[PDB]
Amino acid sequence: DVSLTPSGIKVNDEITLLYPALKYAEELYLLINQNKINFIKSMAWPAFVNNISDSVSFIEQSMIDNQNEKALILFIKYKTKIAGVVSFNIIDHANKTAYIGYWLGANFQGKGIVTNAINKLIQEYGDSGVIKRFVIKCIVDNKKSNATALRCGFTLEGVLQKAEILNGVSYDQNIYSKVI
Ligand SMILES: CC(C)(COP(=O)(O)OP(=O)(O)OC[C@H]1O[C@@H](n2cnc3c(N)ncnc32)[C@H](O)[C@@H]1OP(=O)(O)O)[C@@H](O)C(=O)NCCC(=O)NCCS
Ligand SMILES: Nc1ncnc2c1ncn2[C@@H]1O[C@H](COS(=O)(=O)NC(=O)[C@@H](N)CCC(=O)O)[C@@H](O)[C@H]1O
């Protein structure tokens, strides 16, 4: 499979899902910084990304988790730029289940980048039999994520009551799945 390269997973002619590396720290930090105000609306961690060293720490931990298959953290490269992150936040090996996370900078939204990335990951891990069940969990009112999940052929399984906390407030999540 020539799409599985040493540096990452080639989705199409424009998108590569890069294995994390320290060289990416600067660009990743700057991207997060540019999007901090909007990102804080849907994710908890951006509020605390205050310097490049925070992105270095994230990369270091991500490489450890990737090595040990605890997670699969990938940096989305669109053309020449890092566009965001797509991940298996958690890999449950015993139950062959992967929990998916993602984000894109504002300048990279509306381009199908995450839909294309997810479809590629599900082909690679799902059609190979490594993962049986893929899961997306996001806050109910996350309109754009819901659209992405449905676009990728996920099914809504239910609402997880008061399951995600942002800034001290618990919010309901939709749980979507795609089963091979
Ligand atoms: C969730 C998020 C990644 C969605 O980004 P997105 O760009 O809408 O994601 P997709 O890859 O599914 O792209 C779909 C959009 O691209 C457009 N489109 C353009 N080219 C396309 C292509 N090749 N394939 C599919 N759609 C394409 C679609 O029309 C759609 O645009 P629309 O929203 O104007 O209808 C983004 O809103 C985000 O980063 N949010 C903050 C982080 C977050 O909430 N994460 C999830 C928390 S659990
Ligand atoms: N410090 C950091 N720098 C750069 N990216 C970071 C980051 N911390 C998390 N990410 C990436 O953000 C994406 C979304 O992950 S996330 O915010 O934790 N939320 C979720 O994945 C949702 N499933 C909500 C959590 C839940 O299920 O309860 C995931 O792609 C995740 O890898």
CATH number at residue 159: 3.40.630.30
Report which secondary-structure segment, H or E, holds 20.
Answer: none
Q: Determine whether the shortest distance from the Cβ of 173 to ligand 1 is under 6 A.
A: no
Q: Which two tokens stand for residue 9?
A: 């997973």
Cα–Cα distance for residue pair 116/114, rounded to 1 Å:
5
Known binding site: residues? 42, 45, 87, 89, 102, 104, 110, 112, 114-115, 138, 142, 145, 148, 151
Domain that holds residue 139: 1-180
Q: Which two tokens stand for residue 45?
A: 């961690």
Nearest ligand 2 atom, CA 44: 17
DSSP code of 154?
Answer: -
Q: Determine whether the shortest distance from the Cβ of 15 to ligand 1 is under 6 A.
A: no
Match 């989305």 to its residue by tokens.
Answer: 76
Pocket test for ligand 1, best of 145, 150, 164, 175 (most atoms within 8 A of CB): 145
Residue 73: name the closest of 100, 108, 35 by CA.
Answer: 100
Q: How many angstroms from the chain centroid is the CA of residue 115?
A: 11
Nearest ligand 1 atom, CA 118: 11
Residue nearest atom 8 of ligand 2, based on CA coordinates: 45
Give the CA distances from residue 100 to residues 23, 50, 53, 143, in Å, rounded to whole numbers and listed in that order.
Answer: 24, 25, 25, 17
Q: How remote is the CA of residue 118 from the centroid of ligand 1, in Å?
A: 11
Q: How remote is the CA of residue 106 from the centroid of ligand 1, in Å?
A: 10
150 HSE (CA, 13 A, CB side):
8
Residue 83: name the closest of 94, 95, 72, 74 by CA.
Answer: 74
Q: How remote is the CA of residue 101 from the centroid of ligand 2, in Å?
A: 6
Reported structure resolution in angstroms: 1.2
Residue 157: name the closest of 172, 141, 135 by CA.
Answer: 135
Residue 22: name the closest of 51, 63, 50 by CA.
Answer: 63
DSSP code of 163?
Answer: E
- Strand 133-139 versus strand 169-179 pairing type: antiparallel
Q: Which two tokens stand for residue 115?
A: 């839909």
Number of domains making up the chain: 1
Residue 59: name the closest of 19, 89, 99, 92 by CA.
Answer: 19
Q: Which two tokens stand for residue 72?
A: 């699969």
